[PDB]
Amino acid sequence: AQMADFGAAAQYLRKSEKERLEAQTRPFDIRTECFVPDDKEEYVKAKAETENGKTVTIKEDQVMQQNPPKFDKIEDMAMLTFLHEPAVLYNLKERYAAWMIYTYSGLFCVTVNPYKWLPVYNAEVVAAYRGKKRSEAPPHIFSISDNAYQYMLTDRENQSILITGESGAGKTVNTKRVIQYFASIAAGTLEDQIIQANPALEAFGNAKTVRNDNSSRFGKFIRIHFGATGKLASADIETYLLEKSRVIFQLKAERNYHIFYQILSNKKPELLDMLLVTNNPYDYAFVSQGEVSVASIDDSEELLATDSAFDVLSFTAEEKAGVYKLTGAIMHYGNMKFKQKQREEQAEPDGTEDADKSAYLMGLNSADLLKGLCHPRVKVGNEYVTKGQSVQQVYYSIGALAKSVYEKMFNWMVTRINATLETKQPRQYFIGVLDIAGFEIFDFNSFEQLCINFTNEKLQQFFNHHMFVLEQEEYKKEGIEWEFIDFGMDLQACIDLIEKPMGIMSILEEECMFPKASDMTFKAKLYDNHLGKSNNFQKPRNVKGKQEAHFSLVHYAGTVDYNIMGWLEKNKDPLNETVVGLYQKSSLKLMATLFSTKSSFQTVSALHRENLNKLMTNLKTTHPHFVRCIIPNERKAPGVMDNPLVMHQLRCNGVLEGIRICRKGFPNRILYGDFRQRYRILGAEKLLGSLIDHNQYKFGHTKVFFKAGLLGLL
Amino acid sequence: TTALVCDNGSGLVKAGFAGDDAPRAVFPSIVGRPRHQGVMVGMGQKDSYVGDEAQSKRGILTLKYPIEHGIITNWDDMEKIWHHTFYNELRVAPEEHPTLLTEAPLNPKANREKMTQIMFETFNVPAMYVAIQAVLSLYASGRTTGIVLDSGDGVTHNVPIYEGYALPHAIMRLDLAGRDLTDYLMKILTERGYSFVTTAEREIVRDIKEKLCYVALDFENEMATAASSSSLEKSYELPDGQVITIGNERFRCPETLFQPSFIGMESAGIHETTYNSIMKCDIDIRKDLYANNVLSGGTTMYPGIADRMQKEITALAPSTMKIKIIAPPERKYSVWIGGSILASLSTFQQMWISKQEYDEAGPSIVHRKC
Ligand SMILES: Nc1ncnc2c1ncn2[C@@H]1O[C@H](COP(=O)(O)OP(=O)(O)O)[C@@H](O)[C@H]1O
């Protein structure tokens, strides 16, 4: 009735009543159809004796009784009776087979990339969601965006959109379609403007990851602004913490940010000659640690796209050649070589060719650079005194310099873009579009993975807090007396030992300052402080055949193992203020514009943690709205998803967390009339006074609440 | 909350915040009081000046150090200096910062007990701790093994440490330092005609010592050279004109560190006490001690002291060991740097002496447990 106005798209958004009513009467049994594990599917239906094309007999408290066919295509699994892994898995499988790539999950919004053009977005014939709520329309994200509009207008409070992004595609198209929706509602457009200069971010904050080929190594938080009354204004984007350790160190079979290789494509010899640089990548260490090139992409077209982006931006000749000079100088850093002074402990240079290159490039002096690197100076009270240096300390200084150069250049380009997309009258309200990397579980986890997992941990605890308070509100609404330990914070507050200034990263910096500290000493200290005294901290199970881990933590995404080899090199950032002063005077005006505005302790962990807390404060002042994109298959074919890949994804996507938490309901909350009609075989006081446990329900204001595992009997 | 590091020393207060690269406040540990009359009514004359304010009104004041040989011998003056350090130089409130004080080894217990009592009662620090200057110097040098020779203004001491273990039976403490060299220079300058007797003139002579004095690699032929030519003579200009020129005094002043018989002391030179402290250690660690002689403090800042030290110890030790004198270019603040590193460690935050432990145990808490 209310769906036929979507026409050809109604079949996708919500099927007609006929197939659904014939699907609500399927003959299925609760005691002859369960779910058992598997080697290729990991989860299969069966008939302890079990057969579905393969026979096994297993324990009777590991099977999952399949869901009732009353609910076998509902788009919101928050109403099922048997909430378990294969239930949700095959539910999504089925709703994706009979094409409906959209799904509600409690509070999330799970969508799947269809790999197929669908008119489910265009034209406005489907974008007619105007005015509606989420609960009544078919489960489209445009309804979510409309709800965000209604909320921001009716409370004058900022809103937030958090999508999972490490999926290669589905992130892009979903961002595009939602921002197009926002352009439409509160109406060379701002979307054109956004996607014009996006190659900047693509070339600076993206690199080939072992399980990807274009991964955003930073957070994109688009602020799309609205008028005081609700007409769209200009939109300023905000960037955050960046995996800047990538600047120097790269693992095997990976590489740092594209721009190096884009330039190195030997496309425009003017650059490669202005930077006095060859084309062999194996001559510059900061990029040649892993792989020098991936055959899944060409670099010439990337260089040309980036040139076009610089042109459409307000960059001049200097605002382009200077950035090229900065990148070239960072690369010429990679092969600066120093030796101990003969018979004594002091770094001495051997060959200054790269020093000449860098001094010419940045607008600096070669001798001044060399000495200020070899002779740091401090402000002691009201005096100046030089400091001696071992070679490794100077190498630390060089790496920190390169990192800071790259980071501030990145931030300045961010501000430049935010300016170039800004011309508008005074505004008040906006919607937050938070793009972020997701959880990582690779076969060899390292420090950067610990950082990203901690970020995602904070974000997941944040979401859990949100869903906790909304559920508590709903329970107060129906007079439903039920109180519980905060699901939002306490279950995860114990897995953030990493932040407590005695935990993992704290002890990490402690060792960074501790003399002669080794990874073995670090492991010793870790085991002293946490082995046995923590339940989440456990020893890894290193069985010969895999790379060795050194400790294991139980996150929400399973139990993760890490290998601590090389982490002191990852975290140390002793910044050399002398060369900072050198920068603040350079003739290369871009350098001065970067570093315009009574040190030896800076750790990547510290800055990472503080930026994370900054983003958390940025969020906690607003109201969130979540999105969960999924890549169904790796062969990119439409129609079928490979279940182990998608299952691992959904595990790390965190929706299973929402399922586990609503299991602590009463996730099933029904009215009186529906249950009175559907189960009258013999007002609800008499109907459930007939029969089970009386805590299975909580009668209040024409609402019945059910724990999972009750409607499999009805 | 951040903590304060307050390396006192007998000649220079160096304070700052735990976590910085260098001390924020470095001023003389001195208290001056006016001698003369005072005639201008309404000038608003203070009762006493501390720090480098007493160094600019130097001409009319009489200066006194409240620390003689690492020992605080005037507790009211030390209280004045701490009050200054907290409220006027650092500009903080001591009630909100744990304080890390520092002290030389082998000095009376009442010194530490009074430090603790003063801090907790008349400054209400939340916690405090009293480290050893040599350990912090080793922290700052970035190693866990070596025999550190600290030589400040009042006291010179060796502390041999191996793998983080101190050898307290081999600690050797000597009581000639910068101030005894300043006095010997004041006395040795009279044979050219210059007469410095005032305390202000003692400060002048200290500046002469810091600017013109060096250690001679070979004392005897250096003496003969200075006697032959006049290429070693330099000139210094007092703060009223009146240039003075000194010859062999330049290297005769710090030579006292290697021949303490010049000032009538019976001890051995710093090279020989270093060697003795080494030879008092277990035969298996002294090869690694021979190669990690860490120098610290201001009195180890003379030009050519590392070369003379290495020559002397090499002449003493067996001819197979590798003698390495480690002399950083900033060794004058090694104690403070190491103290900030220490007070910044996460594993150290349980080593503080909380106010409650003091309230339970008395001032004797300090050495009895920490
Ligand atoms: N450049 C220098 N050359 C020689 N002696 C110095 C130099 N600088 C300081 N001193 C001596 O060092 C002493 C102060 O050193 P310091 O390490 O601050 O002692 P403390 O730690 O006891 O305050 C002064 O007495 C001064 O004579």
mmCIF file of N, CA, C and O and ligand atoms in Angstrom, chain B residues 7-14 26 29 133 150-155 177-179 181-182 206 209-211 213 296-303 331-333 335, ligand 1:
data_model
loop_
_atom_site.group_PDB
_atom_site.id
_atom_site.type_symbol
_atom_site.label_atom_id
_atom_site.label_comp_id
_atom_site.label_asym_id
_atom_site.label_seq_id
_atom_site.Cartn_x
_atom_site.Cartn_y
_atom_site.Cartn_z
ATOM 1 N N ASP B 7 67.096 20.199 41.811
ATOM 2 C CA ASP B 7 68.499 19.968 42.140
ATOM 3 C C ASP B 7 69.119 21.177 42.824
ATOM 4 O O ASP B 7 69.333 22.214 42.193
ATOM 5 N N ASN B 8 69.449 21.040 44.106
ATOM 6 C CA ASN B 8 69.857 22.192 44.899
ATOM 7 C C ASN B 8 71.318 22.534 44.682
ATOM 8 O O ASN B 8 71.646 23.634 44.234
ATOM 9 N N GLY B 9 72.214 21.620 45.022
ATOM 10 C CA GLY B 9 73.625 21.907 44.898
ATOM 11 C C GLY B 9 74.071 23.012 45.829
ATOM 12 O O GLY B 9 73.246 23.752 46.370
ATOM 13 N N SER B 10 75.373 23.149 46.020
ATOM 14 C CA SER B 10 75.893 24.137 46.945
ATOM 15 C C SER B 10 76.279 25.439 46.271
ATOM 16 O O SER B 10 76.767 26.343 46.947
ATOM 17 N N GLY B 11 76.091 25.559 44.964
ATOM 18 C CA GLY B 11 76.440 26.796 44.300
ATOM 19 C C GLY B 11 75.404 27.341 43.347
ATOM 20 O O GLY B 11 75.487 28.504 42.949
ATOM 21 N N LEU B 12 74.414 26.535 42.979
ATOM 22 C CA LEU B 12 73.481 26.926 41.932
ATOM 23 C C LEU B 12 72.212 26.112 42.065
ATOM 24 O O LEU B 12 72.263 24.886 41.990
ATOM 25 N N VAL B 13 71.084 26.780 42.226
ATOM 26 C CA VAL B 13 69.793 26.112 42.203
ATOM 27 C C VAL B 13 69.390 25.907 40.757
ATOM 28 O O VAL B 13 69.481 26.826 39.942
ATOM 29 N N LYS B 14 68.955 24.696 40.428
ATOM 30 C CA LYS B 14 68.438 24.385 39.102
ATOM 31 C C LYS B 14 67.093 23.710 39.287
ATOM 32 O O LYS B 14 67.033 22.550 39.695
ATOM 33 N N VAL B 26 67.755 28.795 36.702
ATOM 34 C CA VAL B 26 69.112 28.546 37.164
ATOM 35 C C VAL B 26 69.647 29.851 37.724
ATOM 36 O O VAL B 26 69.900 30.795 36.968
ATOM 37 N N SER B 29 72.662 30.040 44.426
ATOM 38 C CA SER B 29 72.084 29.694 45.719
ATOM 39 C C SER B 29 72.777 30.555 46.755
ATOM 40 O O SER B 29 73.780 30.167 47.344
ATOM 41 N N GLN B 133 72.722 12.297 43.433
ATOM 42 C CA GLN B 133 73.090 13.060 42.248
ATOM 43 C C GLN B 133 73.766 12.188 41.200
ATOM 44 O O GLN B 133 73.569 12.381 39.994
ATOM 45 N N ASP B 150 81.100 13.050 39.918
ATOM 46 C CA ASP B 150 80.359 14.295 40.014
ATOM 47 C C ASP B 150 81.164 15.292 40.831
ATOM 48 O O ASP B 150 81.660 14.957 41.907
ATOM 49 N N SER B 151 81.293 16.510 40.318
ATOM 50 C CA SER B 151 82.100 17.535 40.973
ATOM 51 C C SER B 151 81.392 18.871 40.794
ATOM 52 O O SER B 151 81.532 19.517 39.756
ATOM 53 N N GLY B 152 80.637 19.280 41.801
ATOM 54 C CA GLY B 152 79.931 20.539 41.731
ATOM 55 C C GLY B 152 80.660 21.668 42.422
ATOM 56 O O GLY B 152 81.834 21.912 42.152
ATOM 57 N N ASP B 153 79.975 22.361 43.325
ATOM 58 C CA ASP B 153 80.561 23.486 44.031
ATOM 59 C C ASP B 153 81.069 23.129 45.415
ATOM 60 O O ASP B 153 81.950 23.822 45.927
ATOM 61 N N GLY B 154 80.544 22.077 46.029
ATOM 62 C CA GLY B 154 80.914 21.769 47.390
ATOM 63 C C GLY B 154 81.604 20.441 47.601
ATOM 64 O O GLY B 154 82.433 20.318 48.503
ATOM 65 N N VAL B 155 81.294 19.444 46.783
ATOM 66 C CA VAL B 155 81.719 18.083 47.081
ATOM 67 C C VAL B 155 81.931 17.326 45.778
ATOM 68 O O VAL B 155 81.216 17.534 44.798
ATOM 69 N N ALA B 177 86.087 21.117 45.796
ATOM 70 C CA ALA B 177 85.228 21.302 44.645
ATOM 71 C C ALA B 177 85.444 22.715 44.131
ATOM 72 O O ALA B 177 86.482 23.327 44.396
ATOM 73 N N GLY B 178 84.485 23.217 43.361
ATOM 74 C CA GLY B 178 84.629 24.535 42.769
ATOM 75 C C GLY B 178 84.985 25.619 43.764
ATOM 76 O O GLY B 178 85.802 26.491 43.473
ATOM 77 N N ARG B 179 84.387 25.585 44.952
ATOM 78 C CA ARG B 179 84.595 26.684 45.885
ATOM 79 C C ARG B 179 86.006 26.699 46.451
ATOM 80 O O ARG B 179 86.580 27.773 46.657
ATOM 81 N N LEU B 181 88.588 25.701 44.829
ATOM 82 C CA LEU B 181 89.411 26.214 43.745
ATOM 83 C C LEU B 181 89.283 27.722 43.630
ATOM 84 O O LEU B 181 90.269 28.414 43.372
ATOM 85 N N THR B 182 88.077 28.252 43.817
ATOM 86 C CA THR B 182 87.904 29.699 43.831
ATOM 87 C C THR B 182 88.728 30.338 44.937
ATOM 88 O O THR B 182 89.370 31.371 44.727
ATOM 89 N N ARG B 206 85.365 33.975 40.901
ATOM 90 C CA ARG B 206 84.693 32.821 40.322
ATOM 91 C C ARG B 206 84.483 33.007 38.829
ATOM 92 O O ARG B 206 84.643 32.065 38.047
ATOM 93 N N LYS B 209 87.699 32.411 37.097
ATOM 94 C CA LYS B 209 87.966 30.979 37.040
ATOM 95 C C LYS B 209 87.178 30.319 35.923
ATOM 96 O O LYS B 209 87.711 29.486 35.186
ATOM 97 N N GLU B 210 85.908 30.683 35.776
ATOM 98 C CA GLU B 210 85.098 30.076 34.731
ATOM 99 C C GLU B 210 85.493 30.535 33.338
ATOM 100 O O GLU B 210 85.123 29.878 32.365
ATOM 101 N N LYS B 211 86.210 31.646 33.205
ATOM 102 C CA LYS B 211 86.533 32.133 31.872
ATOM 103 C C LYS B 211 87.961 31.888 31.418
ATOM 104 O O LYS B 211 88.190 31.793 30.214
ATOM 105 N N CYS B 213 90.537 29.616 33.062
ATOM 106 C CA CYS B 213 91.302 28.514 33.624
ATOM 107 C C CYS B 213 91.115 27.244 32.807
ATOM 108 O O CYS B 213 90.040 26.982 32.269
ATOM 109 N N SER B 296 80.490 14.680 35.400
ATOM 110 C CA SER B 296 79.286 15.440 35.681
ATOM 111 C C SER B 296 79.633 16.648 36.532
ATOM 112 O O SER B 296 80.714 16.731 37.112
ATOM 113 N N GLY B 297 78.701 17.588 36.595
ATOM 114 C CA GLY B 297 78.858 18.755 37.431
ATOM 115 C C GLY B 297 79.689 19.844 36.785
ATOM 116 O O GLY B 297 80.364 19.651 35.778
ATOM 117 N N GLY B 298 79.650 21.017 37.410
ATOM 118 C CA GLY B 298 80.291 22.177 36.822
ATOM 119 C C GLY B 298 81.804 22.143 36.901
ATOM 120 O O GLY B 298 82.486 22.559 35.966
ATOM 121 N N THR B 299 82.352 21.659 38.010
ATOM 122 C CA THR B 299 83.800 21.674 38.172
ATOM 123 C C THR B 299 84.514 20.745 37.202
ATOM 124 O O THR B 299 85.743 20.773 37.130
ATOM 125 N N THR B 300 83.781 19.931 36.452
ATOM 126 C CA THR B 300 84.359 19.104 35.407
ATOM 127 C C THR B 300 84.272 19.757 34.041
ATOM 128 O O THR B 300 84.289 19.053 33.030
ATOM 129 N N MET B 301 84.173 21.080 33.987
ATOM 130 C CA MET B 301 83.984 21.793 32.740
ATOM 131 C C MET B 301 85.239 22.491 32.250
ATOM 132 O O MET B 301 85.176 23.210 31.253
ATOM 133 N N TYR B 302 86.371 22.302 32.910
ATOM 134 C CA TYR B 302 87.591 22.939 32.459
ATOM 135 C C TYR B 302 88.026 22.367 31.115
ATOM 136 O O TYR B 302 87.852 21.178 30.850
ATOM 137 N N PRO B 303 88.584 23.199 30.242
ATOM 138 C CA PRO B 303 89.127 22.681 28.987
ATOM 139 C C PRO B 303 90.330 21.792 29.244
ATOM 140 O O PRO B 303 91.299 22.203 29.879
ATOM 141 N N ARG B 331 77.254 18.498 30.469
ATOM 142 C CA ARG B 331 77.341 17.771 31.726
ATOM 143 C C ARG B 331 77.108 18.640 32.946
ATOM 144 O O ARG B 331 77.039 18.107 34.053
ATOM 145 N N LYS B 332 76.978 19.952 32.786
ATOM 146 C CA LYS B 332 76.718 20.794 33.942
ATOM 147 C C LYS B 332 75.302 20.630 34.466
ATOM 148 O O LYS B 332 75.040 20.966 35.621
ATOM 149 N N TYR B 333 74.387 20.110 33.653
ATOM 150 C CA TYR B 333 72.999 19.928 34.055
ATOM 151 C C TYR B 333 72.583 18.469 34.001
ATOM 152 O O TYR B 333 71.389 18.174 33.910
ATOM 153 N N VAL B 335 72.628 16.182 36.290
ATOM 154 C CA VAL B 335 71.830 15.767 37.434
ATOM 155 C C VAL B 335 70.380 16.174 37.244
ATOM 156 O O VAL B 335 69.467 15.383 37.485
HETATM 157 N N1 LIG C 1 82.864 26.699 32.545
HETATM 158 C C1 LIG C 1 83.370 26.439 33.769
HETATM 159 N N2 LIG C 1 84.681 26.206 33.949
HETATM 160 C C2 LIG C 1 85.187 25.951 35.162
HETATM 161 N N3 LIG C 1 84.452 25.902 36.278
HETATM 162 C C3 LIG C 1 83.125 26.120 36.235
HETATM 163 C C4 LIG C 1 82.497 26.403 34.950
HETATM 164 N N4 LIG C 1 81.192 26.574 35.186
HETATM 165 C C5 LIG C 1 80.998 26.410 36.511
HETATM 166 N N5 LIG C 1 82.152 26.145 37.131
HETATM 167 C C6 LIG C 1 82.307 25.898 38.573
HETATM 168 O O1 LIG C 1 81.255 25.030 38.961
HETATM 169 C C7 LIG C 1 80.691 25.434 40.195
HETATM 170 C C8 LIG C 1 79.181 25.282 40.090
HETATM 171 O O2 LIG C 1 78.933 24.005 39.512
HETATM 172 P P1 LIG C 1 77.572 23.207 39.769
HETATM 173 O O3 LIG C 1 77.654 21.893 39.056
HETATM 174 O O4 LIG C 1 76.402 24.115 39.561
HETATM 175 O O5 LIG C 1 77.689 22.961 41.341
HETATM 176 P P2 LIG C 1 76.406 22.584 42.208
HETATM 177 O O6 LIG C 1 75.797 21.440 41.449
HETATM 178 O O7 LIG C 1 76.982 22.217 43.541
HETATM 179 O O8 LIG C 1 75.597 23.840 42.223
HETATM 180 C C9 LIG C 1 81.156 26.852 40.446
HETATM 181 O O9 LIG C 1 81.813 26.900 41.710
HETATM 182 C C10 LIG C 1 82.166 27.176 39.370
HETATM 183 O O10 LIG C 1 83.433 27.518 39.951
#
